Nucleic acid binder design. Structure first.
Ligand SMILES: [Zn+2]
Ligand SMILES: [Zn+2]
Lengths: 197, 197
DNA sequence: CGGGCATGCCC
DNA sequence: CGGGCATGCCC
C-alpha cells in the first residue's frame, strides 16, 4: 500500500482551475464532461482535452503534473496502474502508466521511488495572446472496467501546478470513467444522481 | 498462426468415450454438463471431473492428453492461452497453460515446439475392479470471457488416448464455457437451442 | 450510429 | 443462494 497524495482542491494565489470542452450527443462520443458530477467520461487511448485557466501568470519553469488515484476510501492506498493485458499491448510512456500526454516534446513520465505512483508532467505554457486558457491532451490507456487494473473502480485525475522548486501552486481534480460508450454512461449517471442521489 | 489438431471424434478399437457427472440445480454450480450441447459449463480453477470409458483395455504405457482449441473457424489457428492477468496471478503447471490436472503425480505439461500449443498429459489408469471408468480432475484457469485470453470465444477440449509410441488410439472432444455462473449459462444456452437453434 | 445481449459480480 | 446491474461489443 502507498501513501495517498492530496486531492483537496487548492485554486491558490494564481486562481488555477480546469475547463473542459462541450461534446456531441452520441452514445459513443470520444470524450464528454459532466459538470454536475465533476466527471470526465472518455474512451481509452483517445484524446481528452483539459484546459488550464489561471488569473495570474505562473512563474517561468512552472510544471503541470497529472496523476490518477482511486476515489473510494477502500482503494485509495492502491497504485493506479495499466492492466496486464494493455501493458503487454509511443516511445516515451512506460507501458505500465495509465495516463499519457500527446503532442508534447517535453513530456516526462515519473515513477515515485517512495510511493511507487505514476505521474506525467509537462511544462506550463501561458495561453497565446487573445486566448483564455492552455489545453493539454491526455490519454487514458485502460478502461475503468479493465480486469487486473482499475476493475470497475472509479478514479480521480489530480492536476497540480508546481513551480520548478517543487512548491504547490494549485491543485484541482476530476473523476474519470474510461469506457466504450461515454455518452451512454454519462447520461445514465446523471439520471441516477437526479433519481436517487 | 498455428496448424490445428483434429477434433474429429474417433472412438477407435478400444471403444473410447467420455462421461460426465450429474450436477445440482444451483445458478453457480461449480461444474455442469449439457448432453444436448456436448458442452461443459464450469467455474475457473475449480474441479471438472471427466470420466474415461473404454470397451477394451489399452496397452501398458498409454497416455491421456488434453488440449484446448478455439471452436470457431476464424479462431481455430490461434493458440489457446491464459490471459495476461491470470498468468501473472501449483508448482508444475506453467503460468501460461489454461488446462491443469489436479491430484496426479505423473502429470506432464507440454509446449509443442512446432505449433506452440499447450497440452497436459497423464498416464491412463484402468478402472478399479467393479468400477466402469477412470476419472481425471481438470481445472480451467481462465473464464471464457477473459480479456486478452479467450475473450468470449468458445473452446473445445480435445482428449486423446495415445499409446507410448505416439499412436492415436482414441479421440473425443467437448465444448467448454468457463464462467461465474455455470447453471445460469447452461440453462440459457439450452433454452436458446430449443427456441431458435 | 443507437438498440440490445452476455457475464462478472454487487459490499 | 438467486435477483439484477454495468459495460464491452455484436459480425
Ligand atoms: Zn486495460
Ligand atoms: Zn484469465
Amino acid at each position: 500500500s502507498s501513501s495517498v497524495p492530496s486531492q483537496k482542491t487548492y485554486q491558490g494565489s494564481y486562481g488555477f482551475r480546469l475547463g473542459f470542452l462541450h461534446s456531441g450527443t452520441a452514445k459513443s462520443v470520444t470524450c464528454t464532461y459532466s459538470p454536475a458530477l465533476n466527471k470526465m467520461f472518455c474512451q481509452l487511448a483517445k484524446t481528452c482535452p483539459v484546459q488550464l485557466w489561471v488569473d495570474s501568470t505562473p512563474p517561468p519553469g512552472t510544471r503541470v503534473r497529472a496523476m490518477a488515484i482511486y476515489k473510494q476510501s477502500q482503494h485509495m492506498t492502491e497504485v493506479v496502474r495499466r492492466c496486464p493485458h494493455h501493458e503487454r499491448c509511443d516511445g516515451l510512456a512506460p507501458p505500465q502508466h495509465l495516463i499519457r500526454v500527446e503532442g508534447n516534446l517535453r513530456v516526462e513520465y515519473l515513477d515515485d521511488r517512495n510511493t511507487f505512483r505514476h505521474s506525467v508532467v509537462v511544462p506550463y505554457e501561458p495561453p497565446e495572446v487573445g486566448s483564455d486558457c492552455t489545453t493539454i491532451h491526455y490519454n487514458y490507456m485502460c478502461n475503468s472496467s479493465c480486469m487486473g487494473g482499475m476493475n470497475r473502480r472509479p478514479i480521480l485525475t489530480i492536476i497540480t501546478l508546481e513551480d520548478s522548486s517543487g512548491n504547490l501552486l494549485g491543485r484541482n481534480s476530476f473523476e474519470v470513467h474510461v469506457c466504450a460508450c461515454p455518452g451512454r454512461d454519462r447520461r445514465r449517471e446523471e439520471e441516477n444522481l437526479r433519481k436517487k442521489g
